Design a protein around this ligand. Structure first.
Ligand SMILES: O=c1ccn([C@H]2C[C@H](O)[C@@H](COP(=O)(O)NP(=O)(O)OP(=O)(O)O)O2)c(=O)[nH]1
Ligand SMILES: [Ca+2]
Ligand SMILES: [Ca+2]
Ligand SMILES: [Ca+2]
Ligand code: NA
Ligand code: NA
Ligand code: NA
Ligand code: NA
Ligand code: NA
Ligand code: NA
Ligand code: NA
Ligand code: NA
Length: 899
DNA sequence: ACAGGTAAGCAGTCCGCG
DNA sequence: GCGGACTGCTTACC
């Protein structure tokens, strides 16, 4: 096979690389890499090197990387540009791997690990590491084995060995329910003291040195705790064995927190992968909470605090450590963020951990692209941060909206880049700008008949291929492929959901099918003959396939959109507000241009004049009122809901879209752009069920609306799905039970009508005081707690949730065991009734947890349900209903005086 | 440091206001 | 005594 790197590091004048060779074997080499950099040279000097603007350069070869760095400094002291890749690791990778890297993941050692540390005096700070590590579970992807290191003897208690027999048993048997599929993969190792455990773990680490190191909070806890514990016991030299090159770096942050860099290892903390690639915002990021959300597994159960779990139930203590490791593996099997990181890393030719940085990622992609044409990248430059304009958002008229069709553009900003040909080296000049509405209304004079233009005043060459459009197109094409798999899996899911209405009472097996492609008629025929058992399993596999496609497509979209963003970041080598503004301004034009065209077209085909069909728009999307399109045929002519949905689906696809296409083609000609790439397709078809009292949808303002959708991007839902954007139901800060209640309120409004809403509201008001306290607690991030802490009491302008944290700290003051609120993390927040013993109007505690038993009964007694209801529930419901012009309570009338 | 701008709602402080 | 304007903070949409 073709060789590929695993890790790369620069240590002085040496490049340390771990790699898989042509025979599939892992090797490590030290290379005294000789880097090249470039300087501008006279035009009379023949050369094959030119900067991106066509200016000749000469290559400077250096004896070592230090000499190259020193040359950069001297060139700065002179005041001349030093061109070329200044990150020598990237240059080395580009030189060593001058081809499209095809990698074998089975050869890459991916380690998942988690440690346990018993601490009687609160959280065990990794920088201090003063408590023994009494458990380590380390999963190796090559061995496919869970290596368990169990400390039997500790100053905090001596315990018996963990039993794998009891671990495998059901909880109803007094067992731990360690999943049966990993029982045979567990390698258990007990130790009679910590030093022997740690020394053995280090020897194990050397035999099976991780390339990718992951787990949950491993970067902020596990890794620095292990490193510091070993350092304090054996000394620094021994602790450095955690690095295959014996090189570590301790980066410190004083509040005393440390993040350790282990040279020769690529750490991908799964919590960071999750936060960056999952596109969620969670009320809590404990592994317990995320596992429940992602996998629908039950919360792990135990009696008493975790600080005494080992002493009381060491059996369960070890089993849960093992399970914790497995849960992350299970989450990755679903989300596949590791696969994504490897894909993007090898594509860009970067250190795998650099997938967290789209700027580093794009710098390497662009550098490799340019290097292939003997072109020389410019030197990075210092720039001041400056604001610049973005997208346009229309101000909607707050109202209900019965029938709605939405449209938006495919990969908006990257498509603008490709269409206009926006790149650092394709800039041709400028023109005099007319007001933006003059271009929107096709009144302003044509910017140029030679160059491709944006209404911000920028002109670009039409003939030349720009490196930014060239490379963004490649990644965009990957994105488009994976989205196809996602939507097909999604459409397949609905087919299965339909067949789950007539499950055949028989015994069979799920059909072997590739869910990435639309089911063939043969498959569909067989599906209508399957048992509920097989169908539900197929639905599970379809949804897993969809999530896999979702991860692949949405994060490639994120990457290309971040290339747009990078143009507006001063640390990007190709930072340029001219290009960034060219993109957003063109986008503003395009949206408001097509709003006009759509309005004009619909009035024409309907026969009316001057009526507003586009009720709302944001960035690249429009929302079209389809009431008059429906009324043109009259509701009577429709058999059922699905009939008019088919009608609108056809109408948009056969009539509106071609008109939209003509409109954008004209705009492309107007701006004399390189290639027409404004592709606007139908998104949602929304409306009430036929013959119902549902209102279909409503807007309360910008970025706040709800729609009862029947079809979304070609997916015909088995049951109508609510599309709610911005409303409190969508916010992680809104209490769980309130989200649920508000959503059902919205469902009833859009699908059933006012009377249904009023029934549900009355019921919720009566019964809500029985809801679990966690389900009705608000959530908030806890930033700058100390900033507002004046002697344990709220300082000036102390935020509500911060006030609640201070209340908590006073209540638990003097308890070294009580859970402490962590700066930057999230808290549950509850209001307290007047005269409560806590001395304040609210209290907060670490999210994802039960509040400590020290004060739990007191908090439950003094919760302010009244404030909770009015503030979190009634107030936003009032906003929904006022906009929709409805009432959630029966109003008073003259009829009230009849019996 | 190490993708971007737009925009919503909640709550605290201050100032005008017989 | 507190409404309205303004600010900080948080978390959305795109
Ligand atoms: O995170 C984002 C999201 C959107 N945007 C900008 C660029 C994007 O093209 C534009 C439209 O947002 P969309 O939600 O429509 N995503 P996009 O148009 O890129 O892709 P697609 O609609 O094909 O999925 O808003 C960002 O800059 N960052
Ligand atoms: Ca011993
Ligand atoms: Ca779009
Ligand atoms: Ca059937
Ligand atoms: Na743990
Ligand atoms: Na059970
Ligand atoms: Na130390
Ligand atoms: Na689309
Ligand atoms: Na007319
Ligand atoms: Na959009
Ligand atoms: Na189309
Ligand atoms: Na879409």
């Amino acid at each position: 096979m073709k060789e590929f790197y695993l890790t790369v590091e620069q240590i002085g004048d040496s490049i340390f690389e771990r790699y898989i060779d042509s025979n599939g074997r892992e090797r490590t080499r030290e290379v005294e890499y000789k880097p090249s950099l470039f300087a501008h040279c006279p035009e009379s000097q023949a050369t094959k090197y030119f900067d991106i603007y066509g200016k000749p350069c000469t290559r400077k070869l250096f004896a070592n990387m230090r000499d190259a760095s020193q040359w950069i400094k001297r060139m700065e002291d002179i005041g001349l540009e030093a061109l070329g890749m200044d990150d020598f690791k990237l240059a080395y990778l580009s030189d060593t791997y001058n081809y499209e890297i095809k990698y074998d993941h089975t050869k890459i050692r991916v380690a998942n690990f988690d440690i346990e540390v018993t601490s009687p005096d609160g959280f065990p700070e990794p920088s201090q590491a003063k408590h023994p590590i009494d458990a380590i579970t380390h999963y190796d992807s090559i061995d496919d084995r869970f290596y368990v290191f169990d400390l039997l003897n500790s100053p905090y208690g001596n315990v018996e060995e963990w039993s794998i027999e009891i671990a495998a048993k059901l909880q109803e048997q007094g067992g731990d329910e360690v999943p049966s599929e990993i029982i045979d993969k567990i390698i258990y190792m007990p130790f009679d003291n910590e030093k022997e455990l740690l020394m053995e773990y280090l020897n194990f680490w050397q035999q099976k040195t991780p390339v990718i190191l992951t787990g949950w909070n491993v970067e902020s806890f596990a890794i620095p705790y292990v490193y510091n514990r070993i350092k304090n016991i054996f000394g620094e030299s021994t602790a450095k064995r955690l690095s295959p090159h014996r090189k570590t770096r301790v980066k410190v942050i004083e509040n005393s927190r440390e993040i350790i860099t282990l040279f020769g290892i690529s750490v991908l903390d799964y919590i960071d992968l999750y936060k960056k690639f999952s596109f969620t915002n969670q009320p809590s990021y404990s592994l317990d909470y995320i596992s429940e959300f992602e996998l629908n597994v039950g919360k792990l159960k135990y009696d008493g605090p975790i600080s005494k779990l080992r002493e009381s139930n060491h059996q369960r203590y070890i089993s849960y450590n093992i399970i914790a490791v497995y849960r992350v593996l299970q989450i990755d099997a679903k989300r596949q963020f590791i696969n994504l990181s490897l894909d993007m890393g090898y594509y860009a030719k970067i250190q795998i951990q650099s997938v967290f940085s789209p700027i580093k990622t794009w710098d390497a992609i662009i550098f490799n692209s340019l290097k292939e044409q003997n072109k020389v990248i410019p030197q990075g430059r210092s720039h001041p941060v400056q604001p610049y304009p973005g997208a346009f958002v229309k101000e909607p008229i707050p109202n209900r909206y019965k029938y709605v069709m939405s449209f938006d553009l495919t990969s908006f900003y990257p498509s603008i880049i490709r269409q206009v040909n926006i790149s650092p080296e394709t800039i041709a000049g400028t023109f005099k700008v007319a007001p933006l509405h003059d271009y929107i209304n096709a009144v302003a004079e044509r910017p140029s008949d030679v160059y491709s233009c944006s209404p911000n005043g920028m002109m670009y060459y039409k003939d030349r291929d720009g490196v930014v459009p060239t490379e963004i197109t490649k990644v965009f094409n990957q994105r488009k492929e994976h989205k196809g798999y996602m939507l097909a899996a999604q459409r397949n899911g609905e087919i299965i959901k339909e067949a789950l209405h007539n499950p055949n009472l028989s015994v069979d097996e799920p059909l072997d099918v590739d869910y990435r492609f639309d089911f063939s008629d043969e498959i569909k025929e067989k599906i209508k003959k399957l048992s509920a058992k097989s169908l539900n399993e197929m639905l599970f596999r379809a949804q897993r396939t969809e999530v896999a496609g979702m991860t692949a497509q949405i994060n490639r979209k994120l990457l290309i959109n971040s290339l747009y963003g990078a143009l507006g970041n001063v640390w990007f080598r190709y930072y340029d507000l001219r290009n960034a503004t060219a993109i957003t301004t063109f986008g503003q034009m395009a949206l408001q241009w097509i709003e006009r065209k759509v309005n004009e077209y619909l009035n024409e085909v309907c026969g009316t004049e001057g009526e507003a069909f586009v009720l709302y728009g944001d960035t690249d999307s429009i929302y079209v009122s389809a009431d008059k399109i429906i009324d043109k045929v009259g509701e009577s002519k429709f058999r059922d809901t699905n009939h008019w949905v088919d009608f609108l689906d056809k109408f948009a696809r056969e009539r509106m879209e071609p008109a939209i296409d003509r409109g954008f083609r004209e705009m492309c000609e107007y701006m004399n752009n390189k290639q027409h790439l404004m592709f606007m397709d139908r998104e949602a078809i929304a409306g009430p069920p036929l013959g119902s009292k549902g209102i279909g949808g409503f807007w309360t303002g910008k970025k706040r609306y709800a729609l009862n959708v029947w079809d979304m991007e070609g997916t015909r839902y088995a049951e109508p799905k609510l599309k709610i954007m911005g409303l409190e139901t969508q916010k992680s800060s809104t209490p769980k039970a309130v989200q649920k209640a508000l959503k059902e309120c919205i469902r009833r409004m859009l699908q059933e009508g006012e009377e249904s809403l009023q029934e549900y509201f009355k019921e919720f008001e009566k019964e809500f005081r029985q809801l679990n306290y966690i389900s009705i607690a608000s959530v908030s991030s806890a930033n700058n707690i100390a900033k507002y802490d004046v002697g344990g009491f709220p300082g000036p302008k102390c935020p509500f949730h911060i006030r609640g944290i201070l209340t908590y700290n006073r209540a638990i003051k003097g308890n070294i065991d009580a859970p402490q609120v962590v700066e930057g993390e999230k808290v549950y927040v509850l209001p307290l009734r007047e005269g409560n013993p806590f001395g304040d109007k609210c209290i907060a505690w670490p999210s994802g947890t039960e509040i400590t038993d020290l004060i739990k009964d007191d908090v439950l007694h003094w919760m302010d349900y009244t404030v909770l209801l009015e503030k979190t529930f009634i107030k936003p419901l009032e906003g929904f209903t006022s906009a929709a012009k409805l009432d959630y309570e029966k109003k008073a009338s003259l009829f009230d005086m009849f019996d």
